[PDB]
Amino acid sequence: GSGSSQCNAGPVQCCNTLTSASNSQAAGLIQQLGLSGVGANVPVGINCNPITGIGAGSGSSCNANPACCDNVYTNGLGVQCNPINVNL
Numbered sequence: 001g002s003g004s005s006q007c008n009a010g011p012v013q014c015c016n017t018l019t020s021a022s023n024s025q026a027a028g029l030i031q032q033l034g035l036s037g038v039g040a041n042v043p044v045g046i047n048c049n050p051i052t053g054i055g056a057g058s059g060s061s062c063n064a065n066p067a068c069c070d071n072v073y074t075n076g077l078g079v080q081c082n083p084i085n086v087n088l
Helices: 023-035
Strands: 010-016 018-020 045-048 065-068
Touching: 010 018, 010 045, 018 065, 023 045, 045 065
Parallel strands: none
Antiparallel strands: 010 065, 018 045
């Protein structure tokens, strides 16, 4: 097991903050990568990494905010991050 059982759009992500692309944190990153097409209502994951360390929490989960994203860039910017159910 890799720990990425959830998320059909890729591997499981652990974001420092799940917010919208209208957030200054997100757009800062978005504009760092030069991402066009991401509107203000678009979901994004701030500082997201792939949760591939089984053992953190109840197994695989994020201490901050767990999400599934369409794309996650190495700066940690995720696009289209939907919140994962972790004892939601």
